[PDB]
Write a protein that binds this DNA or RNA. Sequence first.
RNA 1: GGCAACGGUUCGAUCCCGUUGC
Length: 304
Amino acid sequence: MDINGVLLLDKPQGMSSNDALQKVKRIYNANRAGHTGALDPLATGMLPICLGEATKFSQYLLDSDKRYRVIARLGQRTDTSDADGQIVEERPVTFSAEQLAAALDTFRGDIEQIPSMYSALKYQGKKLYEYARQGIEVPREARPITVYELLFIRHEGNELELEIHCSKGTYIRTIIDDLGEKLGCGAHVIYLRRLAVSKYPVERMVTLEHLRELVEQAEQQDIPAAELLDPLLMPMDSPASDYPVVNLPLTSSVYFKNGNPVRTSGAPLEGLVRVTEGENGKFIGMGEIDDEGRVAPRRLVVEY
RNA sequence: GGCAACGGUUCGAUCCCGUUGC
């Protein structure tokens, strides 16, 4: 009876996303757990953790939009593009308000970006950061990303604060590093927090410290930690909330769960769909409309 | 399940996800 669901963790500053994920996995005594998009050690914010069967649908969040609040230090460029790196260039901040306004605008909409060597992108079976730490640079192609919104928050002294809503795989550190160059003074990230992933309620986000306080409380009150921990989870199908839901009577789901495509009344002409059973509307997995217009099973939840 | 190659994700995921091979 493993736990299935999504925990919206507020990642602690300085901790790697994997380390945060593993601590949560242990707190929930889960058999399987994965996160839906890493945050740098320096960053904090929403790190969705899929537990149990929920990991099967992590791709929908890995590919979703995200929103960040960032503060850049102007006048200094670092090798990592953030405060955890080494300063490689230092120049005077001399741009004008008009120049800043123009530079920021070049990052709005559909743009292209060459990611930092300090990233988890793969190159011949190894992460780019592995080469970076060895003092080895490798060729990287520019990747298309979309900045849905970029809000200028403030420019005070050598600090520039922005809020960015972007598509999956967008490197804020690179937008900032690139911006620093366009501004003629260089820049690096000194503050970064992911405010949200997709449409998840920011109010459901919980800190690692709060999880530990609940574990402590459960012991204090002599009750299963699950009684206090499980209510914090979003449904295991929440990662696929964007897709239409199709319900099948139990007489049809039995074949569906055996790998057979099935016909149903309410079903879209195409695309992926969440599939539920009987009246209780139990989620049994993801399906997909095939040629015959049938709902074919794609990724199902284990039965038992 | 598992193993491997390759790719993903905002950087110290062997660990989560995807493609392919066994």
